[PDB]
Enzyme design. Structure first.
Site, short mmCIF file in Angstrom:
data_model
loop_
_atom_site.label_atom_id
_atom_site.label_comp_id
_atom_site.label_asym_id
_atom_site.label_seq_id
_atom_site.Cartn_x
_atom_site.Cartn_y
_atom_site.Cartn_z
N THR A 175 -12.25 8.01 -13.28
CA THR A 175 -11.31 7.50 -12.29
C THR A 175 -11.69 6.15 -11.65
O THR A 175 -10.84 5.48 -11.08
CB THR A 175 -11.07 8.55 -11.19
OG1 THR A 175 -9.69 8.52 -10.82
CG2 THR A 175 -11.93 8.29 -9.97
N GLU A 224 0.84 -1.19 0.00
CA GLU A 224 0.00 0.00 0.00
C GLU A 224 0.88 1.24 0.00
O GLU A 224 0.59 2.24 -0.67
CB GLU A 224 -0.88 -0.01 1.25
CG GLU A 224 -2.33 0.23 0.97
CD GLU A 224 -2.62 1.68 0.76
OE1 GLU A 224 -1.96 2.49 1.43
OE2 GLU A 224 -3.51 2.01 -0.05
CA LIG Z 1 -8.51 6.10 -9.84
#
Ligand SMILES: [Ca+2]
Ligand SMILES: *[C@@H]1O[C@H](CO)[C@@H](O)[C@H](O)[C@H]1NC(C)=O
Ligand SMILES: *[C@@H]1O[C@H](CO)[C@@H](O)[C@H](O)[C@H]1NC(C)=O
Ligand SMILES: *[C@@H]1O[C@H](CO)[C@@H](O)[C@H](O)[C@H]1NC(C)=O
Length: 488
Positions: free
Chosen positions: A479, A347
């Site tokens: 997105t 991450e």
């Molecule tokens: Ca994105």
């Protein structure tokens, strides 16, 4: 080794989606998300049925007629004028990219090259009607003195702004694509006007000086739209802003040519100043964060979407430089996948800048790992993000090199071998652990909308949704991996 669709590979991804859906449909629907182990659910997305809307278009591109019909029958039932919970805050940003984006992409696909996957025209029309209904409530976000959207609004008891005094560029700059799309689809110019006004403050930054040309600050005042800082990056709080700049240019090269110019400055500036090489692996290139003229050797899975963005820009602008840089980015970030014990990327990770010597020092336990890997982990978990599969996908669409499909395949395989949990798939605790370190019992909606979508498309057959390397694109991914038809 020229590439071509791989039926066996595509089928596997389709199979992972099928499993995930069955489990979600049976234990969580119509709630937002499924917890595959406990077989429970949550409503992080205000309880409107996040996973169902986010996965709808993925189901359409896969030819899953049945699943599509199930969701279409549900859409008209959603109540986008309230929340089950009173005084519950709603993220303008998260709601926009998932719900509005999901409804609009499904609408464009079901009315375009995928209209066969739906017969009931009234159900298709609901998608657009429900999107406008949602937007009519969300629009209260723009009732600030400057026009810069307030990040949070409320629907229950009434439609109101949270009253925040500032917002970040990512959340402010990730509304223009879907709101402009809505105006074009409805004929009501208000939506685009609102989003574009808030965006205007980000295109000609006033207040804090730009760290570098095109590299703006992170937070913008809602009262006067001025910047108060000179920090930023290609990850949380800023990422999707730079992304939509070039994507708006694809949506309409004329109307948003200025957006394209702001992207080029950003792009050129991150290439000459944000590109960073790990001291132990110079061949690798990551994106550093910044504050003023100073950069920090830290990054993560969110910034891995960058590779695909530079590639996209290189296609639309016929500039090899952006394509080359994007390819390097996709490759470098994949190295954080291929070098862990699970084969899945962390991450958050960090390194030592090979030039400025900046950056920390590998924690004692990861000393040897950094020497050969070129980075160390700062945030070990993985929650089914898609950014890397996204970048690998673009890399393949622009090169035609089957090598990219192999990398993506290695990525999907590593992901399902460790994330396979309970009824479907789940976020995992430790990526540096061979088995994944244990599931955290959660299956985010973007698993349906993005990870499985990009993984599938890279092995799937040609269509208008696929990004064309030699231009002529008729679609644009928002997105949250929701493709919209371009203005035309
Ligand atoms: Ca994105
Ligand atoms: C949606 O919720 C609002 C507030 O609870 C209510 O007034 C309205 O009747 C509901 N709409 C539908 C279609 O049930
Ligand atoms: C779906 O199409 C059928 C036509 O067979 C129609 O009866 C139905 O009302 C449509 N869905 C709804 C409930 O809007
Ligand atoms: C803009 O508003 C902010 C509050 O968010 C305030 O700090 C700043 O001084 C204002 N800028 C000017 C000069 O209007």
């Amino acid at each position: 080794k020229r590439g071509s669709p791989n039926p066996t590979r595509a089928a596997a991804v389709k199979a992972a989606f099928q499993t995930s859906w069955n489990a979600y449909h049976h234990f969580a629907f119509p709630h937002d998300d499924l917890h595959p182990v406990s077989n429970s659910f949550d409503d992080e997305r205000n309880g409107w049925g996040s996973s169902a809307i986010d996965g709808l278009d993925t189901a359409i591109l896969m030819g899953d007629a049945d699943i599509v019909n199930t969701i279409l029958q549900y859409v008209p039932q959603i109540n986008f004028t309230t929340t089950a919970v009173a005084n519950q805050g709603s993220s303008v940003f998260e709601t926009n990219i998932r719900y509005l984006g999901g409804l609009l992409s499904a609408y464009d696909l079901l009315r375009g090259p995928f209209s066969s996957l739906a017969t009931n025209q009234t159900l298709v029309n609901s998608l657009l009607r429900q999107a406008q209904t949602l937007a009519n409530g969300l629009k209260v976000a723009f009732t600030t003195p400057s026009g810069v959207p307030d990040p949070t609004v409320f629907f229950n008891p009434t439609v109101r702004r949270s009253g925040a005094s500032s917002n970040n560029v990512a959340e402010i700059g990730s509304l223009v694509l879907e709101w402009t799309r809505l105006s074009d689809l409805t004929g009501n110019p208000q939506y685009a006007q609102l989003a574009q006004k808030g965006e205007s403050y980000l295109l000609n930054p006033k207040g804090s000086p730009e760290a570098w040309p095109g590299l703006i600050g992170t937070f913008v005042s809602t009262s006067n739209g001025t910047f108060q800082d000179s920090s930023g990056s290609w990850s949380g709080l800023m990422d999707s802003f730079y992304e939509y700049l070039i994507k708006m240019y694809l949506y309409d090269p004329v109307a948003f040519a200025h957006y394209k110019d702001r992207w080029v400055l950003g792009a050129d500036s991150t290439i000459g100043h944000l590109g960073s090489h790990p001291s132990t692996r110079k061949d690798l290139t990551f994106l550093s964060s910044y504050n003023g003229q100073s950069t920090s050797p830290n990054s993560g899975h969110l910034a891995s979407f960058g590779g695909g963005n530079f590639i996209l820009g290189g296609i639309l602008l016929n500039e090899q430089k952006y394509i080359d840089f994007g390819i390097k980015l996709a490759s470098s970030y994949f190295g954080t996948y291929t070098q862990t014990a699970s084969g899945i990327g962390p991450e958050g990770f960090a390194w030592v800048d090979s030039v400025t010597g900046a950056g920390g020092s590998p924690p004692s336990s990861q000393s040897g790992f950094y020497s050969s890997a070129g980075f160390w982990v700062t945030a070990p978990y993985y929650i089914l993000r898609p950014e890397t599969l996204e970048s690998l996908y673009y890399a393949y669409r622009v090169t035609g090199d089957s090598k990219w499909q192999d990398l993506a395949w290695e990525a999907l395989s590593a992901i399902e071998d460790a994330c396979r949990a309970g009824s479907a798939y789940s976020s995992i605790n430790d990526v540096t652990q061979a088995n994944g370190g244990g599931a955290s019992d959660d299956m985010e909606s973007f698993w349906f909308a993005e990870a499985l979508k990009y993984a599938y498309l890279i092995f799937a057959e040609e269509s208008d949704v696929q990004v064309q390397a030699t231009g002529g694109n008729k679609f644009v991914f928002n997105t949250e991996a929701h493709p919209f038809s371009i203005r035309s």
